[PDB]
Amino acid sequence: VKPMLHYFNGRGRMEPIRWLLAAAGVEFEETFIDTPEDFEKLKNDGSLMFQQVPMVEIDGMKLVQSRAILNYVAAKHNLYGKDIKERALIDMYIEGVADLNEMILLLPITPPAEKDAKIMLIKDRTTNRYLPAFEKVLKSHGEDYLVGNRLSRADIHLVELLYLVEELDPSLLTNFPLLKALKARISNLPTVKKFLQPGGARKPPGDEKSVEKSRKIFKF
Amino acid sequence: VKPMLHYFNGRGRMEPIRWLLAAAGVEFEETFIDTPEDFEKLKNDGSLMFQQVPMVEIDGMKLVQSRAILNYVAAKHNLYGKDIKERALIDMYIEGVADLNEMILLLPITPPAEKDAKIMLIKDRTTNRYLPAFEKVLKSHGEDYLVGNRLSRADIHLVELLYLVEELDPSLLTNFPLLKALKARISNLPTVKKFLQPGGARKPPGDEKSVEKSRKIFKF
Numbered sequence A, B: 001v002k003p004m005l006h007y008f009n010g011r012g013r014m015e016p017i018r019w020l021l022a023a024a025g026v027e028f029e030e031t032f033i034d035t036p037e038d039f040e041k042l043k044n045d046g047s048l049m050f051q052q053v054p055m056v057e058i059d060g061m062k063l064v065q066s067r068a069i070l071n072y073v074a075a076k077h078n079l080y081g082k083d084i085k086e087r088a089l090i091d092m093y094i095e096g097v098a099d100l101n102e103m104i105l106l107l108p109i110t111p112p113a114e115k116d117a118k119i120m121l122i123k124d125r126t127t128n129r130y131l132p133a134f135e136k137v138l139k140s141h142g143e144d145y146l147v148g149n150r151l152s153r154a155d156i157h158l159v160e161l162l163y164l165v166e167e168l169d170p171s172l173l174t175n176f177p178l179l180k181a182l183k184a185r186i187s188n189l190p191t192v193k194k195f196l197q198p199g200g201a202r203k204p205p206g207d208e209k210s211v212e213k214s215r216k217i218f219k220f
């Protein structure tokens, strides 16, 4: 039976789980949290170990914590490397992706007075810290994939971040030719291609009225 | 050969790696970052994939990202559950530990005007969200360990957080008798006992002059 994704109708912290399950060719369904009363039903059901989402129902568990869900999907569907040494590289790479993701993820709820400086810090970190590091990985081995010459979650998570970087400012990708080639190849895996095509589960970026909706339901 | 831990002489993000390696009975050494020039040497050496610490040299890798290092230690030393289903529970539990840890970890750099409210939010989340959740896990199975009736990193990470909670306010543990019993049993594993005893690698809590030292080296 298909996993069931419980979240808001939006990217938030569920978006990387959509990408990873899509890349694994796993068909899923979503129950959207449309109102406060929807969130309150999940809590009063005892479905949420920490009273939070994302929550995914898979293989008879109600899994919360984005990283717990991702770790379980990657391992079940052979996207977590061949051995614990490849896993160490994959984790080091995707934890770097996660830190830059987090800065972009919190932009919409940044006091608008400190938003410019926060956008400058993101552009600086993208061009001077993260993307040069992943570019050097691809430069060092010349293979099509970040780890083990084989598709992993690291490729999937990095390519999702490269799309977010391009949405923020396309010039940020200009000096990273190997990352652009990675983004083109991963986008063309049959599973990911359907995910990005019209009718795919890929969520649109927020607007100011969409962040408003999420700020009254979770109230953060 | 023993792993080499690169960090500041303090808890920060390296403290859970000290606990986990100690619990596994793995002897380690530390190279402390005492000055800006120490941090600059690690960066200019190309040792830090993302120009950050923690960094651990283990089995011929220079691993950065706290979670990558932890994941690799837990898996190598049999503290990550017997199967990917136990791993899903362990990850869900320790990601909840990580969120409450993070709130306590950022207290020292909280604008003092918003610190009281942030301390209230931590006490509220500790007593109403996190500790009731882990108490219920122990209540549901009556076993000595959180997962699989066997020592895992989940026990180690939760017991480190229970000590941090007790340092902040000992009354927070009052209504959690099973968590107190867990803390007493895990504290008495021979490896963890040496870690907590005088001469152990366990780091003291910060003071106002210690956070000052770290704020000029990393400048955050």
Ligand SMILES: N[C@@H](CCC(=O)N[C@@H](CS)C(=O)NCC(=O)O)C(=O)O
Pocket: A012, A013, A051, A052, A053, A054, A064, A065, A066, A067, A218, A220, B095, B099
């Ligand atoms: N560390 C968690 C974070 C979960 C989280 O922050 N969820 C938010 C929505 S994005 C939430 O449920 N907020 C409601 C609350 O905390 O009361 C994860 O990675 O899954």
Ligand SMILES: N[C@@H](CCC(=O)N[C@@H](CS)C(=O)NCC(=O)O)C(=O)O
Pocket: A095, A099, B012, B013, B051, B052, B053, B054, B064, B065, B066, B067, B218, B220
């Ligand atoms: N997500 C990383 C965070 C690493 C981190 O924030 N390190 C800080 C010190 S605690 C640092 O090196 N700051 C220097 C900088 O970012 O320039 C992890 O979990 O290891």
